[PDB]
Amino acid sequence: NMAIIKEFMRFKVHMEGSVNGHEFEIEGEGEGRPYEGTQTAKLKVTKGGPLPFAWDILSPQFSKAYVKHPADIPDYLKLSFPEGFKWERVMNFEDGGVVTVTQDSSLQDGEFIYKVKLRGTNFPSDGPVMQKKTMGWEASSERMYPEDGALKGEIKQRLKLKDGGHYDAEVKTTYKAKKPVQLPGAYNVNIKLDITSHNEDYTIVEQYERAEGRHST
Numbered sequence: 051n052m053a054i055i056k057e058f059m060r061f062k063v064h065m066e067g068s069v070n071g072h073e074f075e076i077e078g079e080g081e082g083r084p085y086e087g088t089q090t091a092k093l094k095v096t097k098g099g100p101l102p103f104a105w106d107i108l109s110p111q112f113s114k115a116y117v118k119h120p121a122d123i124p125d126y127l128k129l130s131f132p133e134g135f136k137w138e139r140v141m142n143f144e145d146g147g148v149v150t151v152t153q154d155s156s157l158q159d160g161e162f163i164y165k166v167k168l169r170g171t172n173f174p175s176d177g178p179v180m181q182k183k184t185m186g187w188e189a190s191s192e193r194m195y196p197e198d199g200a201l202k203g204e205i206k207q208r209l210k211l212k213d214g215g216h217y218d219a220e221v222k223t224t225y226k227a228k229k230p231v232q233l234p235g236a237y238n239v240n241i242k243l244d245i246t247s248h249n250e251d252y253t254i255v256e257q258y259e260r261a262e263g264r265h266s267t
Contacts, residue, residue: 054157055115055128059084061162063091063112069149069170070180074098078112084128087118087262090246093255100251103173106184106209107141109243109257111151111166114225117239117261124234125263126201130227132157139223141207147173178209178217185210189242192223193266196233200226203239236266 058081065076075097082089091112095101114137119125127135134156141149149170156163173179188210192203205221241261248255 051129051131055084055131057083057085059115059162060160061091061113061164063093063164063166065108065111065166065168067108067166067168067170069101069103069107069168070173070175072098072102074101076108080113082113082116084116085118087116088260089113089116089258091257091259093257095253099253101253102180103170104179104182104184104209105245105248105252105255106186107147107149107170107179108168109187109245109255110207110221111139111153111168112257113162113164113259114261115155115162116259117263119263120265123237123263123265124232126227126231126233127155127225129231130155130229133228134162135225135227137223137225139221142220143173143179144218145174145177147171147177147179178211183212184217185212186245187243188216189240192239192241193236194234194239194263195236199230199233200224201233237263238266239263 061080063078078093080091114127137153139151151168154165188208192205194203203223207219208216243259246256
């Protein structure tokens with residue numbers, strides 16, 4: 051696996067989504083250092099732009115092959131290649147907005163290929179998502195554990211608000227390799243996702259993420 055998941059790897063991503071019925075597509079490319087836990091992505095809205103909602107609800111959906119893992123925590127999602135893995139996520143926001151996501155991760159011609167499908171619903175029309183009142187995510191801790199033959203992660207994620215405070219989301223994700231490979235025990239992942247640039251209407255956006263697994267015991 052270290053022979054095919056190289057220390058520098060690129061990816062391509064496609065998202066098809068809808069948020070409160072507003073349909074869109076995004077395409078992007080990324081690159082990073084999977085064993086160092088760092089990566090960047092450049093995203094472009096290719097249909098449905100400009101988006102009438104906060105970019106921040108989409109940013110966490112654009113790459114868990116790039117988490118730095120201590121040697122004694124099995125790196126299940128790297129080990130899943132070349133076949134790769136899928137993930138499925140639920141985000142429940144504190145005002146009743148919901149985002150569900152499914153994703154396929156594969157490796158083709160040397161690059162990761164990500165296909166994301168996203169559905170956001172029931173965001174209040176005057177809430178911070180539809181009104182674009184958010185200012186990026188706080189650093190997160192994803193609590194990971196094996197269950198039913200897959201890897202699960204849970205987050206209490208917090209979006210900064212322009213007028214102060216936070217807009218919170220409870221997130222739960224299942225990550226499942228396409229072939230059985232070794233699952234880890236319980237551990238945590240420290241994640242910090244930054245928007246490093248964007249144009250005025252968020253149709254062109256660059257992101258940076260650092261993700262590092264840490265022991266829980």
